[PDB]
Scaffold this active site. Sequence first.
Site, PDB file in Angstrom:
ATOM      1  N   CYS A 118     -37.636   8.241 -37.361  1.00  0.00           N
ATOM      2  CA  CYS A 118     -36.389   8.402 -38.113  1.00  0.00           C
ATOM      3  C   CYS A 118     -35.732   7.081 -38.523  1.00  0.00           C
ATOM      4  CB  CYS A 118     -35.385   9.242 -37.304  1.00  0.00           C
ATOM      5  SG  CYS A 118     -33.898   9.648 -38.249  1.00  0.00           S
ATOM      6  N   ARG A 121     -31.369   6.405 -37.845  1.00  0.00           N
ATOM      7  CA  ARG A 121     -30.801   6.421 -36.504  1.00  0.00           C
ATOM      8  C   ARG A 121     -29.529   5.613 -36.286  1.00  0.00           C
ATOM      9  NH1 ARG A 121     -35.811   5.079 -32.883  1.00  0.00           N
ATOM     10  NH2 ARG A 121     -36.784   4.421 -34.865  1.00  0.00           N
ATOM     11  N   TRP A 290     -28.811  14.122 -43.732  1.00  0.00           N
ATOM     12  CA  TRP A 290     -28.793  14.112 -45.188  1.00  0.00           C
ATOM     13  C   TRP A 290     -30.081  13.440 -45.643  1.00  0.00           C
ATOM     14  CZ3 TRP A 290     -24.512  11.727 -42.587  1.00  0.00           C
ATOM     15  CH2 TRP A 290     -24.574  10.319 -42.463  1.00  0.00           C
ATOM     16  N   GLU A 295     -37.481  10.966 -50.149  1.00  0.00           N
ATOM     17  CA  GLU A 295     -38.079  12.180 -49.595  1.00  0.00           C
ATOM     18  C   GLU A 295     -38.240  13.233 -50.700  1.00  0.00           C
ATOM     19  OE1 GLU A 295     -34.997  12.231 -46.127  1.00  0.00           O
ATOM     20  OE2 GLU A 295     -36.697  13.438 -45.444  1.00  0.00           O
TER      21      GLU A 295
HETATM   22  C1  HEM Z   1     -28.152  11.233 -41.232  1.00  0.00           C
HETATM   23  C2  HEM Z   1     -29.224  11.213 -42.063  1.00  0.00           C
HETATM   24  C3  HEM Z   1     -30.577  11.047 -41.711  1.00  0.00           C
HETATM   25  C4  HEM Z   1     -31.471  10.501 -42.542  1.00  0.00           C
HETATM   26  C5  HEM Z   1     -31.122   9.649 -43.775  1.00  0.00           C
HETATM   27  C6  HEM Z   1     -32.772  10.638 -41.929  1.00  0.00           C
HETATM   28  C7  HEM Z   1     -33.983  10.208 -42.536  1.00  0.00           C
HETATM   29  C8  HEM Z   1     -35.253  10.435 -41.999  1.00  0.00           C
HETATM   30  C9  HEM Z   1     -36.504  10.200 -42.684  1.00  0.00           C
HETATM   31  C10 HEM Z   1     -36.746   9.609 -44.065  1.00  0.00           C
HETATM   32  C11 HEM Z   1     -37.485  10.662 -41.894  1.00  0.00           C
HETATM   33  C12 HEM Z   1     -38.971  10.596 -42.229  1.00  0.00           C
HETATM   34  C13 HEM Z   1     -39.336  11.654 -43.256  1.00  0.00           C
HETATM   35  C14 HEM Z   1     -40.772  11.543 -43.713  1.00  0.00           C
HETATM   36  O1  HEM Z   1     -41.217  10.416 -44.016  1.00  0.00           O
HETATM   37  O2  HEM Z   1     -41.454  12.584 -43.777  1.00  0.00           O
HETATM   38  C15 HEM Z   1     -36.881  11.181 -40.703  1.00  0.00           C
HETATM   39  C16 HEM Z   1     -37.600  11.696 -39.612  1.00  0.00           C
HETATM   40  C17 HEM Z   1     -36.996  12.213 -38.462  1.00  0.00           C
HETATM   41  N1  HEM Z   1     -35.609  12.286 -38.237  1.00  0.00           N
HETATM   42 FE1  HEM Z   1     -34.128  11.578 -39.372  1.00  0.00          FE
HETATM   43  N2  HEM Z   1     -32.674  11.214 -40.672  1.00  0.00           N
HETATM   44  C18 HEM Z   1     -31.314  11.469 -40.529  1.00  0.00           C
HETATM   45  C19 HEM Z   1     -30.777  12.276 -39.492  1.00  0.00           C
HETATM   46  C20 HEM Z   1     -31.516  12.898 -38.495  1.00  0.00           C
HETATM   47  C21 HEM Z   1     -30.942  13.736 -37.470  1.00  0.00           C
HETATM   48  C22 HEM Z   1     -29.504  14.280 -37.400  1.00  0.00           C
HETATM   49  C23 HEM Z   1     -31.919  13.960 -36.549  1.00  0.00           C
HETATM   50  C24 HEM Z   1     -31.842  14.677 -35.328  1.00  0.00           C
HETATM   51  C25 HEM Z   1     -30.733  15.115 -34.652  1.00  0.00           C
HETATM   52  C26 HEM Z   1     -33.100  13.332 -37.076  1.00  0.00           C
HETATM   53  C27 HEM Z   1     -34.351  13.409 -36.450  1.00  0.00           C
HETATM   54  C28 HEM Z   1     -35.529  12.944 -37.007  1.00  0.00           C
HETATM   55  C29 HEM Z   1     -36.837  13.179 -36.431  1.00  0.00           C
HETATM   56  C30 HEM Z   1     -37.153  13.782 -35.058  1.00  0.00           C
HETATM   57  C31 HEM Z   1     -37.732  12.753 -37.338  1.00  0.00           C
HETATM   58  C32 HEM Z   1     -39.250  12.896 -37.249  1.00  0.00           C
HETATM   59  C33 HEM Z   1     -39.675  14.279 -37.723  1.00  0.00           C
HETATM   60  C34 HEM Z   1     -41.179  14.439 -37.750  1.00  0.00           C
HETATM   61  O3  HEM Z   1     -41.847  13.915 -36.826  1.00  0.00           O
HETATM   62  O4  HEM Z   1     -41.686  15.096 -38.688  1.00  0.00           O
HETATM   63  N3  HEM Z   1     -32.870  12.689 -38.294  1.00  0.00           N
HETATM   64  N4  HEM Z   1     -35.484  11.053 -40.750  1.00  0.00           N
END
Ligand code: HEM
Lengths: 414, 416
Positions: A118, A121, A290, A295
């Site tokens: 992520c 973070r 968001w 993406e």
């Molecule tokens: C606030 C905005 C947030 C943005 C901008 C964001 C952005 C991202 C992006 C770009 C990815 C990778 C997507 C990809 O390349 O397929 C990702 C993965 C992830 N995010 Fe975030 N994230 C945010 C919030 C969150 C929240 C609230 C959580 C959890 C409470 C979270 C948990 C994760 C996890 C666990 C992954 C990995 C998922 C996987 O293994 O497929 N994210 N995030």
Amino acid sequence: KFPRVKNWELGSITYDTLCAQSQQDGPCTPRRCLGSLVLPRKLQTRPSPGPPPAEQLLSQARDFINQYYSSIKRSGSQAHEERLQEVEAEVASTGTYHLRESELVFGAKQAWRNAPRCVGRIQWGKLQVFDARDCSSAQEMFTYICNHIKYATNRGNLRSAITVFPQRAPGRGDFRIWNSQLVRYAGYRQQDGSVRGDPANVEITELCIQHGWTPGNGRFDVLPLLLQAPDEAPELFVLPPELVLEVPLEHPTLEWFAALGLRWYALPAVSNMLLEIGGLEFSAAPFSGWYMSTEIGTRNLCDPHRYNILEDVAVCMDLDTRTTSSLWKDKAAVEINLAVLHSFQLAKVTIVDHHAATVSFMKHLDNEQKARGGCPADWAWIVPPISGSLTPVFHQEMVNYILSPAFRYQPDPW
Amino acid sequence: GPKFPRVKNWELGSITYDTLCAQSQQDGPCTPRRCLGSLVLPRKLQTRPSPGPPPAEQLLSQARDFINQYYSSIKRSGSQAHEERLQEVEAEVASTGTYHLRESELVFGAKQAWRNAPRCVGRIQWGKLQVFDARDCSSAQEMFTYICNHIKYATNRGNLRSAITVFPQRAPGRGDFRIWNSQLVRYAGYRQQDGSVRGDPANVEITELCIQHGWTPGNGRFDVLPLLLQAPDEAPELFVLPPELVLEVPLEHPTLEWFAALGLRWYALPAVSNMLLEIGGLEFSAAPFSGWYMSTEIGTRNLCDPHRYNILEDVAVCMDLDTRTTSSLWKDKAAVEINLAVLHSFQLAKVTIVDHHAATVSFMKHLDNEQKARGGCPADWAWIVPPISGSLTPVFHQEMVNYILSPAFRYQPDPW
Ligand code: HEM
Ligand code: HEM
Ligand SMILES: [Zn+2]
């Protein structure tokens, strides 16, 4: 022992000491690195028909409780000691235990904080945690999910949130959200194998139809939810259109772009991952924040196995699609990402571009270095799918490892 | 299923298993505890100067392995010639402490090293490599002649040809043959008053070393550096490459007429010269190699990296983009045009080059050939996927397994 981490743009170096706290193994070994692999070959979350070894669960529980009390600066206090005893007492007699709401809240935020893939973070501390553990039916799940969506969407001013349904229990089926995200566009297999809509959702689209859903015939038909209560066949629930915010795609200068009829939903809410806290497992815990513009603009719309709209936009831009060297793909990709950003900003819906997002992640890395001595990060997922080296994270070495609380993948319930 | 890494391609949904990794005889930096795959120089292969002769026991095992690889490649494994060759090697190591490779063994090893390189996306060409044997080289001056011949043959007036020149291997307690420059062609990097750099910031140290050794520096942004060549146990000697031999390409854009006014340019021949070639335990500290450029190396990395020429802002300003906000994607727009400029200019000058789409498509073919031929292919994902338009190319969606196979090219400490 402790890895030297270097940033090739600045020349700066740091040492990751946090990785020593990892208790879970990854897929790599000294013989070969399997870091690029998306899913684990064994690091899955096997069935729960039997009680997890009390010895193991107990250690993970103690460690989590220890983490919790350190967070509130009350380590070694009376409460800390008595909380451990409560946990010990419950595990010894029942083979499991339960978290207190405050601990759950701390656990959900840490799992996000620990997610290596992520990039957003830096926001880890701002997460609205909805306790839905007092849920006993798919219908109740549906209500919780609607409240989560209404709250998270907030009329375009998205707020990060997570809803936590009942933990998994020995010998009993799991509460599960069959869909991979709360909002997905149908994928209909047609004529010669081709697909109308989102090719990624073919299987789920079909499952919904098999459970009584009256399918549509569009490219962006919001799917219904298949919510499952323990040992019960999943149930179909349609989401109130007024709850599903969408953004029509148009271009800042290219008049014709809007005619393409493209659009995308505002809320990215992952719902097929498992949340693990102190040995406890939450099979249904949808979370949302968001979108980062790439993406949608790059992956969802341009992936070959997705909406694959690159060529169309290219022809529309009257580009030379005869050869690769004209860089027509690169050019269309950029305008498509520009369209996404322009559109979301126009519709007043929260979104972040890959440049702003990665700059914020570098700050997060620095914040974490001081706070915990490191930050687990998966380089391949952190670096954007386009303009990789044009962002700061590209030039930053990263160490990847598994920390708990953690979000993990789990088998499809069917 | 099979007890080997399962590799998936997410675009095609196809699956394969890598059995070749079972052949790896050297550990990388990762462990079940943490992945260090993104580290550029993890203290692993790093061929640190090991003066005192190597353990005859360790060298022999490596040599036997290489000889087995050779006879296997010519389908004579287990033959009389194979066993007799194994006897030579062991005997030569027994009496002298080391051994030597036959001509064809060197050719085979050099190609395998390239074939084994995890970070090289151009490996589909591995079979076509001109191997110049220069193991008779005895002076820094002679190194210069060999190198000049390499440049001439490889450049071939724009129709580049892959090649490698192998100088004498390392000998016990004896000085190493070394090329101080990281590449045979590099642009000077001059430290300034305000503290900035004129030219390529990547070559500041080498530029200063050339000066400390008698080089009269210039003051341009693209001054070709001279070579610091070192023969065993002698201080490095300075040599200036004749200008007629260093082919360069002025950069111009197909439609943006002002781009040519920027006065940007790049050289045609990419020749890595500071890497160590290891074959059957033997170490070739000086073995420069060259192929041709993939356009993103010049247009994205060399010209746009923050710590390199960093021309992103200048070009964006000329394109009149909003460089005050990230959401305008001004960096992405400028990068594309710069990369297009590189491709267009090279094509115009009839100098070999391959764009990132073509290169990655060809690497996918290579992965397929290698799956059949060896049961796998070691690849470093972060280095294979291009620095721009990553997911627009096929390699992005291809999972990869990284491991160390020998023969191999390795990093080695700087001679100074
Ligand atoms: C606030 C905005 C947030 C943005 C901008 C964001 C952005 C991202 C992006 C770009 C990815 C990778 C997507 C990809 O390349 O397929 C990702 C993965 C992830 N995010 Fe975030 N994230 C945010 C919030 C969150 C929240 C609230 C959580 C959890 C409470 C979270 C948990 C994760 C996890 C666990 C992954 C990995 C998922 C996987 O293994 O497929 N994210 N995030
Ligand atoms: C035929 C054209 C070739 C092309 C287009 C090509 C392209 C590339 C590219 C794009 C890289 C990574 C550059 C970077 O990201 O910094 C690379 C690395 C590498 N290539 Fe190739 N290559 C070719 C020929 C060769 C030849 C002839 C050899 C050796 C015989 C070779 C050996 C290597 C090695 C060892 C590396 C990694 C060096 C490092 O770690 O810095 N390549 N190649
Ligand atoms: Zn690894």
